[PDB]
Design an enzyme around this catalytic site. Structure first.
Site: not given
Ligand SMILES: CNc1nc(C)c(-c2nc(Nc3cccc(O)c3)ncc2C#N)s1
Lengths: 296, 255
Positions: A13, A17, A35, A83-85, A129, A131
């Site tokens: 997404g 910024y 990011k 880290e990825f979630l 923030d 939510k």
């Molecule tokens: C503001 N929301 C987001 N920022 C970061 C950097 C994101 C992020 N995303 C994932 N995986 C994920 C998968 C599906 C939908 C979703 O909204 C997120 N994991 C970690 C981060 C962080 N930090 S998205």
């Protein structure tokens, strides 16, 4: 700086910024969230949101706060490696629209969220923030605070901070009333709304505007008086013409909730920020006595 | 309400964000005197743009830490300081002045490109660790230990603490919490003849004994303030905004 080691997998997404990608470390196999932040190298330089997000997130290591793994510098770009979630709470709620989120999981998620928030507040950081979109879950049953782009280090006591804060629906009354001062209580309010939303399957106060928002709160919790909220009448954006609605029976506000659940919620949605329950204190609430860690 | 957790954490972080005490001797081309000039100017900038005192404190901390690991020629000292003030503003201010304003204040000494690039370099050098505890941060906590709050005490304490920013020698060897301690007692004693309160002794673990060295230094700075080459802080605290506390007379003795 170089991203040669990262292979982009798919986009997650954008934010205004920063653009966010799911990526893979080609050497270690680690999956991350990248990011990308454009630096305004001919005008404003590094964005204040990035500066705050990075400096604050570096101090905050906790199981229930997303981990910032690395910051990669370029002359023109900044890359935050998280880290990825697997998913955010908002999308998880949409997927759970038909069946609802099991109460044991709601309890677990709230418990974990409070642990993460308590750590934030213990380290003089306001999130500002909170939510469902900014709350990330994994396959193991964990949930973590994310997106610290609106956060800031506060002082004791606080000064007047940015008024334009918190997404409308999850915004505390004191902010809507134009309070000179707000603090940790605004984050608790957001979690309150989020708690209720996890249960009822819809936003507690889906305002269409600032005044609608404020009135939706008034119609649910009742219009605050100087008795329930000492100082409310003196708030900058308070007006005597405010309609006076009676408070609703919490039993109705959030039906599926038990006696302790309703107790906790009411304290998280207390009008007076001074009386509104803290993350730390909330963790010791009866509602969590039997808490477990289910998997989504 | 986290007041205790926060204090403990800040005590931890002030050690980690501490500048190298004897760095000026390792700077071939800059001295304490030039630094004093730089800081005094940042005081003026803070005034000109109605910035928070905290922003000023943060900028000084960034500067001392930058100069702890980076050799700088005198001609670039202001560039470092301007960028540090820019970053402090961005971190701390609701409405930071824009970069153009920071360029203008240097009276065309540097370009916007230079300011921007120095900003990024400062960030790299500090590894983005900008949330430093300041003398100002401890002072505000210390203030909650009043009954009630005395406007002059607070202002005079903010005044003394600010004076400490000007002089690397001797104040680089004192932690913010300690400088805030001396400043709060010194202000209090000057205004109400009262002393470092018990409740603060319990909170900080500091006693008038432990605070003595800094306090003796601070007292001398206070006494000798009117003769200091740098005068921006005194002028600033003449204003009613701070209750003209800089016009007050320092105590002759402390006992
Ligand atoms: C503001 N929301 C987001 N920022 C970061 C950097 C994101 C992020 N995303 C994932 N995986 C994920 C998968 C599906 C939908 C979703 O909204 C997120 N994991 C970690 C981060 C962080 N930090 S998205």
């Amino acid at each position: 700086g170089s991203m040669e080691n990262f292979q982009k997998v798919e986009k997650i997404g954008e934010g205004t910024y920063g653009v966010v990608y799911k990526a893979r470390n080609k050497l270690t196999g680690e999956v991350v969230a990248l990011k990308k932040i454009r630096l305004d190298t001919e005008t404003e330089g590094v964005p204040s949101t990035a500066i705050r997000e990075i400096s604050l997130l570096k101090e905050l290591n906790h199981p229930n706060i997303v981990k910032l793994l690395d910051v990669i510098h370029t002359e023109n770009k900044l890359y935050l490696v998280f880290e990825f979630l697997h998913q955010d709470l908002k999308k998880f709620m949409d997927a759970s629209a038909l069946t609802g989120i099991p109460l044991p999981l709601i309890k677990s998620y709230l418990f974990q969220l409070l642990q993460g928030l308590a750590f934030c507040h213990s380290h003089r950081v306001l999130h500002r923030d909170l939510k469902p979109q900014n709350l990330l879950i994994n396959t193991e049953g964990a949930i973590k605070l994310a997106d610290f782009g609106l956060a800031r280090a506060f002082g004791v006591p606080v000064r007047t901070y940015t008024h334009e804060v918190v997404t409308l629906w999850y915004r505390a009354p004191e902010i809507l009333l134009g309070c000179k001062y707000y603090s940790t209580a605004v984050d608790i309010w957001s979690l309150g709304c989020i708690f209720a939303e996890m249960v009822t399957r819809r936003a507690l106060f889906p305002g269409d505007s600032e005044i609608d928002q404020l009135f939706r709160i008034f119609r649910t919790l009742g219009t605050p008086d100087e008795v329930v909220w000492p100082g409310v009448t003196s708030m900058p954006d308070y007006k005597p013409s405010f309609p006076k609605w009676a408070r609703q029976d919490f039993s109705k506000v959030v039906p599926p909730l038990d006696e302790d659940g309703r107790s906790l919620l009411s304290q998280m949605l207390h009008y007076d920020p001074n009386k509104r329950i803290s993350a730390k204190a909330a963790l010791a609430h009866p509602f969590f006595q039997d808490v477990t860690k289910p998997v989504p | 309400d986290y007041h205790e957790d926060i204090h403990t954490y800040l005590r931890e972080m002030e050690v980690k964000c501490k500048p190298k005490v004897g760095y000026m001797k390792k700077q071939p081309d800059i001295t304490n005197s030039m630094r004093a000039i730089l800081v005094d100017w940042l005081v003026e900038v803070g005034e000109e743009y109605k910035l928070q005192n905290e922003t000023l404190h943060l900028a000084v901390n960034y500067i001392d830490r930058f100069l702890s690991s980076m050799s700088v020629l005198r001609g670039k000292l202001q560039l470092v300081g301007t960028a540090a003030m820019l970053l402090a503003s961005k971190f701390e201010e609701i409405y930071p002045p824009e970069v153009a304003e920071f360029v203008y204040i240097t009276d065309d000494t540097y370009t916007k490109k230079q300011v921007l690039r120095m900003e990024h370099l400062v960030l790299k050098v500090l590894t983005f660790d900008l949330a430093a505890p300041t003398v100002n941060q401890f002072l505000t906590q210390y203030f909650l230990h009043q009954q009630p709050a005395n406007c002059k005490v607070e202002s005079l304490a903010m005044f003394l603490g600010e004076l400490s920013l000007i002089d690397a020698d001797p104040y680089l060897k004192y932690l913010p919490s300690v400088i805030a301690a001396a400043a709060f007692h010194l202000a209090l004693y000057t205004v109400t003849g009262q002393s470092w309160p018990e409740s603060l002794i319990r909170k900080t673990g500091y006693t008038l004994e432990s605070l003595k060295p800094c306090l003796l230094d601070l007292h001398q700075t206070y006494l000798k303030a009117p003769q200091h080459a740098q005068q921006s802080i005194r002028e600033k605290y003449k204003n009613s905004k701070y209750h003209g506390v800089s016009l007050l007379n320092p105590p002759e003795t402390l006992n």
